[PDB]
């Protein structure tokens, strides 16, 4: 086509989606990770994660307001990944890298899994 | 913070949101523009438009499944802007620029209004 493109549009959309999440506006699901609860938008979770994409395209699970993750999932690792989904920024630290990589593998977030593998390889 | 950032994350999220729109997955509103209907996600519309942000933060309108726009709004102009919201690409042409600018003014999409003004000024 002959379209023009606004470079900052995708980033501005994601920033506003994160502002809606922070103010709990039109969030339609709560993700339960052991004793912890995280409110989010199903569309953003699907757009970022192969696991959520599969869950919310399922004809019965698409209608659930609560999703319980596997008990082995670490709430902090999930929190870091949820923040990444809504900001593009990943808080990867020596103290959390193992939990973040395991959570990214479970959530099917291949780019996160990739950077965790590389950061671990460098420390070996 | 000490975060790392994935450059293509925002663009990849928007691409997946557009794929969900194309397959009519988790769309929660229909925008009526005279004889034409457009299905969308309320969160994306709010993230892109000052008008939709005001509508869907309203305690009664947040729950409506149908929103009717002003009869002066051109369906093609709306379609072009809805495509822009979900892709960052604006199909701006001599034959549609007036309808696109008027629709962008109504929807409160200031960056679109700005490029329309500049493209019109250049042709004068």
């Amino acid at each position: 086509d002959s379209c023009i493109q606004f470079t900052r549009h995708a980033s501005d959309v994601l920033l506003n989606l994160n502002r809606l999440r922070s103010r709990d506006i039109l969030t339609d699901v709560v993700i339960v990770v052991s004793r912890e609860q995280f409110r989010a938008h199903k569309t953003v979770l699907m757009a970022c994660s192969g696991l959520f994409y599969s869950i919310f395209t399922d004809q019965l699970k698409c209608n659930l307001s609560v999703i319980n993750l596997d008990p082995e999932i670490n709430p902090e690792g999930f929190c870091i990944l949820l923040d990444f989904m809504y900001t593009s920024r990943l808080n990867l630290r020596e103290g959390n890298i193992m939990a973040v990589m395991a959570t990214a593998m479970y959530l099917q977030m291949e780019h996160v899994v990739d950077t965790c593998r590389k950061f671990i390889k460098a420390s070996e | 913070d000490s975060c790392i950032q994935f450059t293509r994350h925002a663009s990849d999220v928007l691409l997946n949101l557009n794929r969900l729109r194309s397959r009519d997955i988790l769309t929660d509103v229909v925008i009526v523009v005279s004889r034409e209907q457009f299905r969308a996600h309320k969160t994306v519309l709010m993230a892109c438009s000052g008008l939709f942000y005001s509508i869907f933060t309203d305690q009664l309108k947040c729950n409506l499944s149908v929103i009717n726009l002003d009869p002066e709004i051109n369906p093609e102009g709306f379609c072009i802007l809805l495509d822009f919201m979900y892709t960052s690409r604006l199909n701006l042409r001599e034959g549609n620029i007036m309808a696109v600018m008027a629709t962008a003014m109504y929807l409160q999409m200031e960056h679109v209004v700005d490029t329309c003004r500049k493209f019109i000024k250049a042709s004068e």
Binding site: I4, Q5, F6, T7 | R89, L90, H111, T115
Partner: peptide
């Protein structure tokens, strides 16, 4: 704005 750019030409993509």
């Amino acid at each position: 704005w750019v030409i993509p």
